[PDB]
Design a protein around this motif. Sequence first.
Motif, PDB file in Angstrom:
ATOM      1  N   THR A 164     -12.557 -18.305  34.371  1.00 61.28           N
ATOM      2  CA  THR A 164     -13.935 -18.578  33.617  1.00 61.28           C
ATOM      3  C   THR A 164     -14.491 -17.298  32.861  1.00 61.28           C
ATOM      4  O   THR A 164     -13.804 -16.066  33.401  1.00 61.28           O
ATOM      5  CB  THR A 164     -14.889 -18.830  34.662  1.00 61.28           C
ATOM      6  OG1 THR A 164     -15.077 -17.744  35.852  1.00 61.28           O
ATOM      7  CG2 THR A 164     -14.247 -20.470  35.504  1.00 61.28           C
ATOM      8  N   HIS A 165     -15.530 -17.590  32.229  1.00 56.71           N
ATOM      9  CA  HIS A 165     -16.204 -16.626  31.783  1.00 56.71           C
ATOM     10  C   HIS A 165     -16.893 -15.439  32.802  1.00 56.71           C
ATOM     11  O   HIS A 165     -16.495 -14.251  32.489  1.00 56.71           O
ATOM     12  CB  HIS A 165     -17.389 -17.186  31.240  1.00 56.71           C
ATOM     13  CG  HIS A 165     -18.896 -16.297  30.681  1.00 56.71           C
ATOM     14  ND1 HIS A 165     -19.691 -16.945  30.055  1.00 56.71           N
ATOM     15  CD2 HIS A 165     -18.985 -15.193  30.960  1.00 56.71           C
ATOM     16  CE1 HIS A 165     -20.650 -16.046  29.648  1.00 56.71           C
ATOM     17  NE2 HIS A 165     -20.003 -14.738  30.113  1.00 56.71           N
ATOM     18  N   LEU A 166     -17.144 -15.911  33.947  1.00 53.61           N
ATOM     19  CA  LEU A 166     -17.730 -14.963  34.730  1.00 53.61           C
ATOM     20  C   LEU A 166     -16.730 -13.961  35.405  1.00 53.61           C
ATOM     21  O   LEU A 166     -16.864 -12.712  35.338  1.00 53.61           O
ATOM     22  CB  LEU A 166     -18.250 -15.625  36.215  1.00 53.61           C
ATOM     23  CG  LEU A 166     -18.212 -14.699  37.411  1.00 53.61           C
ATOM     24  CD1 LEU A 166     -19.415 -13.785  37.038  1.00 53.61           C
ATOM     25  CD2 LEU A 166     -18.863 -15.505  38.523  1.00 53.61           C
TER      26      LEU A 166
ATOM     27  N   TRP B 251     -14.050 -12.737  33.510  1.00 53.86           N
ATOM     28  CA  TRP B 251     -13.793 -11.933  32.233  1.00 53.86           C
ATOM     29  C   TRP B 251     -14.830 -10.968  32.063  1.00 53.86           C
ATOM     30  O   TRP B 251     -14.813 -10.004  31.663  1.00 53.86           O
ATOM     31  CB  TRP B 251     -13.444 -12.791  30.902  1.00 53.86           C
ATOM     32  CG  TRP B 251     -12.064 -13.461  31.196  1.00 53.86           C
ATOM     33  CD1 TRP B 251     -11.990 -14.792  31.319  1.00 53.86           C
ATOM     34  CD2 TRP B 251     -10.818 -12.868  31.269  1.00 53.86           C
ATOM     35  NE1 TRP B 251     -10.459 -15.091  31.340  1.00 53.86           N
ATOM     36  CE2 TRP B 251      -9.945 -13.902  31.429  1.00 53.86           C
ATOM     37  CE3 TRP B 251     -10.594 -11.302  31.208  1.00 53.86           C
ATOM     38  CZ2 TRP B 251      -8.470 -13.553  31.420  1.00 53.86           C
ATOM     39  CZ3 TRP B 251      -8.945 -11.185  31.331  1.00 53.86           C
ATOM     40  CH2 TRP B 251      -7.910 -12.326  31.393  1.00 53.86           C
ATOM     41  N   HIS B 252     -16.094 -11.481  32.237  1.00 57.28           N
ATOM     42  CA  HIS B 252     -17.249 -10.593  31.987  1.00 57.28           C
ATOM     43  C   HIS B 252     -17.074  -9.364  33.365  1.00 57.28           C
ATOM     44  O   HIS B 252     -17.481  -8.324  33.061  1.00 57.28           O
ATOM     45  CB  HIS B 252     -18.607 -11.430  32.203  1.00 57.28           C
ATOM     46  CG  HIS B 252     -19.889 -10.771  32.242  1.00 57.28           C
ATOM     47  ND1 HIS B 252     -21.092 -11.002  31.917  1.00 57.28           N
ATOM     48  CD2 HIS B 252     -19.906  -9.270  31.983  1.00 57.28           C
ATOM     49  CE1 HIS B 252     -21.963 -10.201  31.692  1.00 57.28           C
ATOM     50  NE2 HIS B 252     -21.292  -8.955  31.752  1.00 57.28           N
ATOM     51  N   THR B 253     -16.708 -10.076  34.487  1.00 58.75           N
ATOM     52  CA  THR B 253     -16.541  -9.143  35.352  1.00 58.75           C
ATOM     53  C   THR B 253     -15.392  -7.956  35.160  1.00 58.75           C
ATOM     54  O   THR B 253     -15.768  -6.569  35.269  1.00 58.75           O
ATOM     55  CB  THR B 253     -16.345  -9.747  36.739  1.00 58.75           C
ATOM     56  OG1 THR B 253     -17.265 -10.703  37.190  1.00 58.75           O
ATOM     57  CG2 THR B 253     -15.677  -8.491  37.935  1.00 58.75           C
TER      58      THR B 253
ATOM     59  N   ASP C 267     -21.018  -5.327  24.709  1.00 66.65           N
ATOM     60  CA  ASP C 267     -20.872  -6.869  24.364  1.00 66.65           C
ATOM     61  C   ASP C 267     -19.615  -7.248  24.619  1.00 66.65           C
ATOM     62  O   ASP C 267     -18.648  -6.536  24.652  1.00 66.65           O
ATOM     63  CB  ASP C 267     -21.310  -6.802  22.851  1.00 66.65           C
ATOM     64  CG  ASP C 267     -21.123  -8.277  22.269  1.00 66.65           C
ATOM     65  OD1 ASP C 267     -20.786  -8.360  21.290  1.00 66.65           O
ATOM     66  OD2 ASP C 267     -21.633  -9.229  23.034  1.00 66.65           O
ATOM     67  N   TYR C 268     -19.359  -8.629  24.617  1.00 68.46           N
ATOM     68  CA  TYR C 268     -17.846  -9.257  24.721  1.00 68.46           C
ATOM     69  C   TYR C 268     -17.756 -10.540  24.280  1.00 68.46           C
ATOM     70  O   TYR C 268     -18.836 -11.039  24.254  1.00 68.46           O
ATOM     71  CB  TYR C 268     -17.525  -8.745  26.324  1.00 68.46           C
ATOM     72  CG  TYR C 268     -18.622  -9.763  27.375  1.00 68.46           C
ATOM     73  CD1 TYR C 268     -20.024  -9.392  27.317  1.00 68.46           C
ATOM     74  CD2 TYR C 268     -18.102 -10.976  27.604  1.00 68.46           C
ATOM     75  CE1 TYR C 268     -20.803 -10.486  27.956  1.00 68.46           C
ATOM     76  CE2 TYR C 268     -19.013 -11.968  28.576  1.00 68.46           C
ATOM     77  CZ  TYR C 268     -20.322 -11.470  28.451  1.00 68.46           C
ATOM     78  OH  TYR C 268     -21.111 -12.181  29.331  1.00 68.46           O
ATOM     79  N   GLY C 269     -16.482 -10.770  24.156  1.00 65.06           N
ATOM     80  CA  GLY C 269     -16.169 -12.194  23.600  1.00 65.06           C
ATOM     81  C   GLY C 269     -15.024 -12.799  24.473  1.00 65.06           C
ATOM     82  O   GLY C 269     -14.020 -11.851  24.314  1.00 65.06           O
TER      83      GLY C 269
HETATM   84 CU   LIG Z   1     -21.341 -12.871  30.977  1.00 57.40          CU
END
Ligand SMILES: [Cu+2]
Length: 59
Positions: A16-18, A20-22, A37-39
């Motif tokens: 999930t997004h979470l 990958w943000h991590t 920033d990230y995508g």
């Molecule tokens: Cu995020």
Amino acid sequence: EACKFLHQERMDVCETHLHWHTVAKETCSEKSTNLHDYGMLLPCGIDKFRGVEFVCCPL
Ligand SMILES: [Cu+2]
């Protein structure tokens, strides 16, 4: 120092997004920088992804 663009992906799991943000946050922190920033990359399933591209900037 300028900001650095980085790309990470996995071929063995969709996450999930979470997750990958991590990953992006912790990667910038290991390099003594802050995530700005990230995508997500390579959408998978109904709500998941196989990688992230992101920019780490100086403290
Ligand atoms: Cu995020």
